[PDB]
Structure 1
């Protein structure tokens, strides 16, 4: 009878929970770079714009990385439903910290809170969506598709609302709106959740057995002690600038999948794991380019686009806008394409090519008009139109192609973390002087690697 778009009613709760969480997150993302520019311009924040850009990327990287851990903590320690709640509380506090009358000094506290908060919430709202369905329920795919629509919806309206708020009432109010967004999500989640969510998920579904507590404790302790020792050594030898710490985080984010690889490849469907390397690298490079929209394209939008009549942060709405527009088309395409459907390796290859084209496109206005002037918003619209076209190919089959080849599964989600970590290095190269070369180089490079993957496509599809 009564459903939410054909799904169990409980989906409406999780849909809105995540919509408002994504609202809070992408509302923040859409103005945080500009906020750091502002803090720099007033002499409050003593970093370069390049470093500010690097912060944005490594921020995203750590958020993605944190998300690969929150599932474990919920499933084994605190439960999925408390994970989402307290995750949301931390996210909200993270935005509240930026709304307070502080400047640069509040940035780190905010970043940590949201990293931890999102890590708790993001994987576990997804988990709770699954719990709405029996094993044999054919609606599961549809329900997640609707769930993802809620994600994109929140990502879409946030830059519009928060960005406008920022320009009208300043950054603190804008960040307060992101906080309020999360609060709304928490209200709907908490009271909505009590009614439709299985009480089972108030507790861990796979709680630590007695003999598991100490080994986990030792693991975490060694990791923290090791990380801290590195920071001590870094400060002793004078590698203690912010870019230095960002490099450390870059190294950590990249080393984690490198080590899982070295593990699996060393430890015979070995051949299959080897086949994932080009797919994973393709995913990483795609996510790198896609995640640069909130950094390099946001920079381009503010410095190089004639946007005198609307908030420049609004460009951040194009990414989720195009996902939502493309989605029913690609949904149709993959069912209608019965004969000769492309392989997932081919989708990755073509997906990366489109990402490459999105940057190659952005090289044109600077090459044609020079970089001193300002250009139409349509250049960015076209760029996002292209990279999202790439996303429609890689994103829906990403988890899929990885699975058909638990550690390796997290690596799919890690590819975006690695992509953002790569960005933390790359985006420091972007400026007005390097603009055309930046877009050309990384655009062409991605296309070439898309072509390389096309050549490799047949091998991979057999394994």
Structure 2
């Protein structure tokens, strides 16, 4: 490691709206990565299930939705792996660079003419690369501000804004291009996007970031390096040999893989919980907190399950169930992916001010989890209504807009205290695993989403949204009820 002072001395403190110019490097690196990721995502599902004669891959709709859910799950998991690689082998600056390259390569694999193999390579590359870039670019931003710098919070706010900004614009740019012209054009704009991110990062990182992220904070010892190398190699050959017999004669298919991820999405959280609870490095008080954290973890998973379907199930809904020809124009179904970030950008400051105004009277953290869940469930009840009231046919887009609006109301309750809840209830020995634990509730939710896709059909649409929405409402009520004790139990 290097001391934070010498690192700070190596980073310029001016140059970007009162902030260090390094914030420019990090804002735009991350903006373009998110832009590219979200643009590609706004059209990917359609690319999968649109007919071959329409530029698509001609996959079954259900398979496309399942793949999309596993995709998000794997991306969430990858960030855990990626964080460890920066911390113990690459440093963060180099993780960002390699991640970017991998991401760019992933987009190119889609931008060129290709079929379903190209899609699978593209996913792998983007899963790996986003794992390396996304958590680590954010680690570097803290590194620019010396301890005690009052600009730090604001610098993080500006940085995070770029992410939402990327999320808002991408469906309007890549979404429009991909749907109106050609899918590969869309994927190409995503590729160019990431390229601009790489360009800004490589061209400016030396002067703007100085020493930040250039060292390995927690390096493996020589013996560890040999251990890791052996485990990897053996691991690589063992995976390879299974697939050799399995892909033709196993059989190992995309269905198996989707199932596997589903299994893992349940198994992993359970192991994490057992390990934390049984750990000899924990106090009796910490053990009670781990137990207290379970309903919060479940509420989170349920919440993200609904929220993450905004990019899968509801994307299909925008495309197959929604009246797009309104006001003399034709709406692109991908454009609905701009609604979640838009509402976040607008409502976040309103909520902030609200909690301030509430002060001592504001809901506790477990109560805000509950509220998030209640709103998420409500968003699904709302969405079932028009298809239920109509005999058939496309429904007015205002309903989908309202459903996205409502889930945002829930997101601004639960999400901003998610990390805080996790840190307050995890044992001190596991303080470093705190971001992973929080990300895991999302990963698990999307892993499960992929197994729920078979239930989504025009015929049981009502049972689908109704059952999931009802589950969330029920869970939200139970959480409200047990929230008092969970709150008093919180560390602080």
Q: Give the structure-2-normalised TM-score.
A: 0.89
CA distances 1:162-204 after superposition (whole Å, capped 9, x unpaired): 1111133200111000000111111112223222113242232
Matching residue of 2:481 = 455
TM-superposed CA distance for 1:116, in Å, is 0.5
Contact 1:55-1:424 at 8 Å conserved across structures? yes
TM-superposed CA distance for 1:430, in Å, is 0.8
Q: Which aligned pairs between 1:12-411 and structure 2 lie closer than 5 A? A: 12-39=24-51, 45=57, 47-220=59-232, 238-267=250-279, 268=284, 269-308=286-325, 309-370=330-391, 372-405=392-425, 406-411=432-437
Among 459, 466, 469, the alignment partner of 1:443 is 469
CA distance, structure 1, for counterparts of residue 113 and residue 322 of structure 2: 31
CA distance, structure 2, for counterparts of residue 120 and residue 409 of structure 1: 15
CA distance, structure 2, for counterparts of residue 222 and residue 281 of structure 1: 35
Contact 1:50-1:429 at 8 Å conserved across structures? no
CA distance, structure 2, for counterparts of residue 215 and residue 263 of structure 1: 23
Contact 1:288-1:420 at 8 Å conserved across structures? yes
Contact 1:20-1:184 at 8 Å conserved across structures? yes
Contact 2:28-2:200 at 8 Å conserved across structures? yes
Among 428, 438, 451, the alignment partner of 2:454 is 428
Q: Secondary structure at the match of 2:459?
A: coil
TM-superposed CA distance for 1:244, in Å, is 1.6
CA distances 1:206-242 after superposition (whole Å, capped 9, x unpaired): 2222232133335545665676687679669855232
User: Taking structure 1 as reference, are residues 380 and 83 closer, same or farther at Cα in structure 2, changes over 3 Å only?
Assistant: same
Q: Secondary structure at the match of 1:339?
A: helix
CA distance, structure 2, for counterparts of residue 233 and residue 286 of structure 1: 39
TM-superposed CA distance for 1:5, in Å, is 4.9
Moved more, 180-189 or 401-410: 401-410
**How many residues end up aligned between the 2 structures?**
462
Contact 1:295-1:427 at 8 Å conserved across structures? no
CA distances 1:4-59 after superposition (whole Å, capped 9, x unpaired): 45433321221111111110001011000000012567798574211110000001
CA distances 1:310-331 after superposition (whole Å, capped 9, x unpaired): 2110000001111111111122
Q: Which aligned pairs between 1:2-17 and structure 2 lie closer than 5 A? A: 4-17=16-29
CA distance, structure 2, for counterparts of residue 221 and residue 253 of structure 1: 25
User: Taking structure 1 as reference, are residues 39 and 86 closer, same or farther at Cα in structure 2, changes over 3 Å only?
Assistant: farther
CA distance, structure 1, for counterparts of residue 449 and residue 53 of structure 2: 23
